């Protein structure tokens, strides 16, 4: 196997319209937002415009290859891959992807896609000019799949994002929390998951 | 049958450009707008910018499969399916679809597509800053099909959906199906008028 073979095999095997569940187990997807900037905030309209890296990872074992005499990873255009149908439920703009649309695929079948995304949200902006700050909550989940098809998990629950966030923003990050919620409704046997990302931030003084 | 098989069969069977009528009955399409936010309002120009989930359902019996010992639903990209040519007649912008363009297809051939859409409308905006509020009407129908090819209906049913963070609040939503038959023309012409009564919060 050379890189060309691996890429060919991945393009042939990954089906963007086919969720890669194995033996009817859910595809375990991790999602973790790393905030890079807060560009505009409106306390009257409760809207924020933010830039973040959306680290998304999952496994498709059918993509795996033997890596002894081959590269252990390759970069693959996401148009050749199934990607989870994640959306932010309180987004009021399309996610503008700023970066090259390439995922990293490891030889054991792990896929990692971390696009930089600019997007606007409707959220609680009150207290942005105070010391406690505002706390803007962004709910992310699968648009069409329940938890027996896709499970969504946060990764790290707690971060200050000091290593990611632009020192040049007018705002500073106090805290970022990323938590899983699971709901089961009376009507329906399966569970519905999302990741709630709570971005606690304030205007620098 | 696994999910791959079902999707393969759907891709082989589906005709995205051909209305899936069964025995010359219309395709019955249900449509229901769930309002999520009202983003911008202009009382001078009578324009509103709104975000809503457009719950749309219909049946394509050719997609059906036997679901004993198989999944009874799958998620399918809408580009692989026929979708109704619905348009809002008083829209002044393209519908910006915010979400992944996947429908749910049930093994009996039912298709459920609920995109989040942002769109601007020309609407009565007068009274938006009063207690009675403004009432903005959005008329949705098929762009090219009459009622013997596509029937459009509301959905046998506000603010389990609407953002608590909007500067507006929803007072009331009314849904009116209209079907008109003209002496000139043999078929009937349909639309659903959704009336969104809303105001600026105190």
């Amino acid at each position: 196997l050379d890189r060309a073979d691996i890429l060919y095999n991945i393009r042939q095997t990954s089906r963007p319209d086919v969720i890669p569940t194995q033996r009817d187990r859910p595809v375990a997807v991790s999602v973790s937002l790393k905030f890079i900037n807060i560009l505009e905030v409106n306390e009257i309209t409760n809207e924020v415009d933010v830039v973040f890296w959306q680290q998304t990872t999952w496994s498709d074992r059918t993509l795996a290859w033997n890596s002894s005499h081959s590269p252990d990873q390759v970069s693959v255009p996401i148009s050749s891959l199934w990607v989870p149908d994640l959306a932010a439920y309180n987004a009021i703009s399309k996610p503008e992807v700023l970066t090259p649309q390439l995922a990293r695929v490891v030889s054991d079948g792990e896929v990692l896609y971390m696009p930089s995304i600019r997007q606007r949200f409707s959220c609680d902006v009150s207290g942005v000019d105070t010391e406690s700050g505002a706390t803007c909550r962004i709910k992310i989940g699968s648009w069409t799949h329940h938890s027996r098809e896709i499970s969504v998990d946060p990764t790290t629950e707690n971060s200050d994002d000091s290593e990611y966030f632009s020192q040049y923003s007018r705002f500073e990050i106090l805290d970022v929390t990323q938590k899983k919620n699971s709901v089961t409704y009376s009507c329906c046997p399966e569970a519905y998951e999302d990741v709630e990302v709570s971005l606690n931030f304030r205007k620098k003084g | 049958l696994d999910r791959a098989d079902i999707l393969y069969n759907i891709r082989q069977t589906s005709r995205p450009d051909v209305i899936p009528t069964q025995r010359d009955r219309p395709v019955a399409v249900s449509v229901s707008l769930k309002f999520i936010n009202i983003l911008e309002v202009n009382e001078i120009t009578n324009e509103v910018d709104v975000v809503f989930w457009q719950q749309t359902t219909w049946s394509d019996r050719t997609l059906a499969w036997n679901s004993s010992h198989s999944p009874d639903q799958v998620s399918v990209p809408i580009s692989s399916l026929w979708v109704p040519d619905l348009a809002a007649y008083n829209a002044i912008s393209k519908p910006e679809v915010l979400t992944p363009q996947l429908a749910r297809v049930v093994s009996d051939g039912e298709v459920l597509y609920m995109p989040s859409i942002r769109q601007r409308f020309s609407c009565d905006v007068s009274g938006v800053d009063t207690e009675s509020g403004a009432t903005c009407r959005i008329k949705i129908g098929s762009w090219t099909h009459h009622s013997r090819e596509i029937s459009v209906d509301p959905t046998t049913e506000d603010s389990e959906y609407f953002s608590q963070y909007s500067r507006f609040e929803i007072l009331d939503v009314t849904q009116k199906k209209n079907s008109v038959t003209y002496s000139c023309c043999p078929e009937a012409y349909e639309d659903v008028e959704v009336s969104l009564n809303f105001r600026k919060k105190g």
């Binding site: 989940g141 329940h146 409704y185 009507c187 | 039912e110 597509y113």
Partner: peptide
Amino acid sequence: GCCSHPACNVNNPHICG
């Protein structure tokens, strides 16, 4: 309930729109 979660909605025709 179910109908205000987009996935639950489209997964449950008999319950939701």
